[PDB]
Structure 1
Amino acid sequence: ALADVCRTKLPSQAQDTLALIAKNGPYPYNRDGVVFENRESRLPKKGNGYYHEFTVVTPGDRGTRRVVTGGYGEQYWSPDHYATFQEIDPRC
């Protein structure tokens, strides 16, 4: 019971990040690709190192917008530094 969001409906910058992830970078930030530990269990509970985070650029500081990836290619959107998540639907 996480909400879905269509990939094509995400901010352009979020879609940019999904494209860089698919290309394995090079990434704009040093912390791109760091483990996300899911300490609040907002994403499905998995083993250590399952999730990683990547910055979604904000025009005008690094900012709060992120994509989180899972180990089998799951993709999640969070505009607010992991306060909230939506599962990215790659089909729309």
Structure 2
Amino acid sequence: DVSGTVCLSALPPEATDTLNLIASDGPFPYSQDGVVFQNRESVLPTQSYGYYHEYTVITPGARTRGTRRIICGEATQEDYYTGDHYATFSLIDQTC
């Protein structure tokens, strides 16, 4: 399941950057950005294969991609934030 809705303004500013990159269709800093997210664990709602895609949320100072990601669903404004490497997800509210 989804844990709730969080305003964009309440997430790390890097979440804002990522969304902006997703709006412009990149380019993205990581080549992994934009791949299918399979939702293998069924945390998110069941959808066809390819409905979800994942994008890195940069972690400052991290040498790796770190643990933060944005998962978009195909629906209008459907975007989920994970800061614990897909353990949990919050829907992002871009209006606040």
Aligned to 2:18: 17
2:82 pairs with 72, 78, 83, which one? 78
Aligned to 1:42: 43
| Gap regions ≥5 residues in structure 2 | none
The 10-residue stretch of structure 1 (28-37 or 69-78) with the greater mean CA deviation from structure 2: 69-78
Q: Which residue type is aligned with residue 31 of structure 2?
A: N
* Paired positions, count: 92
SS at match of 1:5: strand
| Gap regions ≥5 residues in structure 1 | none
Q: Are residues 1:90 and 2:91 paired?
A: no
CA distance in 2, matches of 1:62, 1:41: 23
Aligned to 2:7: 6
CA distance in 2, matches of 1:8, 1:44: 25
CA distance in 1, matches of 2:65, 2:41: 22
SS at match of 2:17: helix
TM-score by length of 2: 0.90
Q: Which residue type is aligned with residue 86 of structure 1?
A: S
Aligned to 2:28: 27
1:23 deviation in Å? 0.7
Q: Are residues 1:59 and 2:63 paired?
A: no
Deviations 1:38-89 (A, max 9, x none): 1111111101110000000011212111000011241000001111100011
Q: Which residue type is aligned with residue 9 of structure 2?
A: T
